[PDB]
Design a protein around this ligand. Structure first.
Ligand code: TYD
Ligand code: TYD
Ligand code: TYD
Ligand code: TYD
Ligand code: TYD
Ligand code: TYD
Ligand code: MG
Ligand code: MG
Ligand code: MG
Ligand code: MG
Ligand code: MG
Ligand code: MG
Lengths: 130, 130, 131, 132, 132, 131
């Protein structure tokens, strides 16, 4: 039984897919543990969240995009939660997942889910320092 | 163009209807303006929110219920937003609405939506004092 | 005020693959299945009892003919005020939001029966669930 | 008996990605497609003919500019009582359960048009499918 | 050609209100119901017969106590390649797109059983529908 | 990497009322309709061109027969990497999550065609949209 961090990206709000995305996590029996609405995320928070990528050349376009609209940060709890929600997120190639059914751009891909126990602990501390 | 207050009640979490409910408001083109997750709402907040009802004999069962599980408080924005989201909420008698399609008890009815300009201003100040 | 009502999923439901869709609308309003029977063909006897009140109508035989034209499922549903709330779920072909309102388009081929009163329920339930 | 009626999927439907959602509700009510055309941009005179009863109203020009602001789909549907049944499906932005009731929140950007009468239906059909 | 297979809707499905959701996915894949029974409580020997290949495992008793903890529905489905197609629909809790992949998160509370072979299928069917 | 691909909604789609469901899956993956035509009956000519590569197969005539058995809609879709992504949406009757995976159950009656490569798209698009 784990906790993991999810961000619902601005494009979800654009395309009104917010509930669709959350619904898929709900219908798999994961529980909201805490949650925040950000009309525009503090760019500092975004930069930390993507620190890993600061050296990639796409980094700035990424931060620009993540701050160009609302986002929701969620802490989800459930059995094998990190691994499972990752699979649920999927990729824009494989049907059945969130990115597989709804997303279409390597950049505008609707959702973030932590990919490891370390990044999960880390990403939760970023959005939910308390 | 108005702002209104919505609560998603504990029974929504019980029955995993949270996204279903939010989805219906999203698909009608209303926008999240701000939002809070409460694993257990401060009973003080609940009592204020339902002050109007303190004289009714059902009052305490009501507060007990509203605090027996998570709730989400949302500020929604959109044309005629107060009136419309009210209609959307509906009642447990009329199909097509949230309560009409999903709820079934006069007490456990999934959602709250402000019913007037005054109560809307008031209810937003309660959950979102800033 | 807990109650019980009798529901028939009609042959057009199977024909058109709307069995899950119909039941799911009843399930989402928090009604519980209490008894259920699948009938590949319903005894013309049982049908005529079910629609005994209509025996003196022009449409009585085409009704029966149709009700035996394919499978049907009889369900006993249970929940607060079930008799009347499931009735509103069923609705009519004129009111969007209901089962007939969204999915049906014909006076006769209309997907679902639901008891219209307590007398009818107690009565209908007996027909389909003699036990 | 069988009627035919004319539907237009408006540009807001394409923008908001509700084209399948809309056609879906009509499909699930057991109505069939007889004719269908996709217009990346509907010609302005077609739009102006289609709304000709509206030609004197203040909103007339803005309406047409809107209906021309993006793609539209015109569809002839066939089904029992199609005209009235599909009018009802469309509903309005005050009626939960209908297309405009669940999905629309604007007097002008309301996703869909359907013929409102036997004659307006026959008329509207010849505009979008004159080759008959 | 046509096969028949046996499905069980488990008690977790009734608790979580996913009975229509589950049957729906099989219905949309074009499989037909031939037989169906609702059990408010399935008799324990039926459950124990149904899982008899499992009788030596540690989990055997807990499994049966679970399958008896609430209602279940048994269904015979008919369709082309039904056994394998419906096994695949069920999937597992690691495979998005399937019943267990989208809706389940427990090794035991996994909503649905379907026959996994021609023989297990014929066998399982006589257990729940012995009157044939 | 914007692309265009040709999609056919087959006669089983209409027969079974899955036209909106199919298109909606394409719409939700953010693909845009660029051209569209409804055909109450498709010219056996156009079909045979479309399936010219299969002309030497056992199934070639039943294929054609079926493709003319009811309406079809040809759609030109457009979006990043559309040719290949719509192909994965279409999937096969063995893989849940795809159109065929969820909705189809037959080698032949399988609801939808999508271009399998750029050559096929450019080629197919021409057949159905000569203009
Ligand atoms: C790898 C990669 C990422 N990105 C951007 C878009 C993504 O939203 C974000 C994160 O990408 P990445 O960390 O590779 O994937 P995930 O979202 O599964 O963690 O960085 C690109 O724009 N191009 C790329 O090649
Ligand atoms: C009127 C009423 C309310 N309640 C409880 C349940 C409801 O969640 C809450 C509010 O009821 P009310 O203010 O009447 O309706 P709304 O939710 O539309 O504002 O009070 C009862 O339990 N019984 C009653 O008769
Ligand atoms: C009234 C009527 C009913 N029927 C059929 C379909 C109905 O489900 C059944 C009884 O009709 P009715 O009492 O109108 O509907 P309900 O199912 O709501 O009781 O008989 C007709 O075929 N034609 C008719 O004119
Ligand atoms: C009344 C009205 C309609 N419209 C648009 C949206 C309507 O679909 C169309 C015709 O209006 P109207 O005839 O009132 O609505 P309906 O479409 O139900 O017949 O014109 C406006 O843009 N402004 C307006 O004030
Ligand atoms: C493996 C396993 C199964 N089960 C339950 C859930 C399974 O549906 C059933 C049989 O297990 P198994 O044969 O592994 O799964 P399947 O249902 O895919 O054949 O028993 C447990 O309760 N505990 C376990 O460790
Ligand atoms: C291979 C094959 C195809 N068909 C039909 C249905 C297929 O959609 C069409 C071409 O077959 P195929 O190339 O296998 O499928 P796809 O549609 O993915 O190209 O011909 C058969 O009826 N039987 C067969 O064995
Ligand atoms: Mg990553
Ligand atoms: Mg009130
Ligand atoms: Mg009646
Ligand atoms: Mg009008
Ligand atoms: Mg097995
Ligand atoms: Mg191929």
């Amino acid at each position: 039984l784990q906790r993991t961090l999810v961000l619902i990206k601005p494009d979800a709000f654009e395309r009104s897919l917010v509930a669709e995305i959350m619904g898929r996590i709900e219908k798999k029996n994961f529980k909201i543990v805490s949650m925040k609405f950000w009309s525009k995320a503090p760019r500092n928070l975004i930069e930390q969240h993507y620190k890993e990528h600061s050296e990639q050349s796409y980094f700035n376009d990424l931060c620009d995009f993540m701050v160009s609209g609302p986002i929701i940060s969620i802490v989800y709890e459930g059995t094998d939660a990190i691994s499972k929600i990752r699979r649920l997120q999927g990729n824009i190639l494989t049907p059945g997942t969130i990115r597989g059914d709804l997303a279409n751009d390597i950049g505008e891909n609707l959702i973030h889910a932590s990919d490891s126990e370390d990044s999960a602990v880390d990403e939760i501390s970023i959005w939910f320092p308390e």
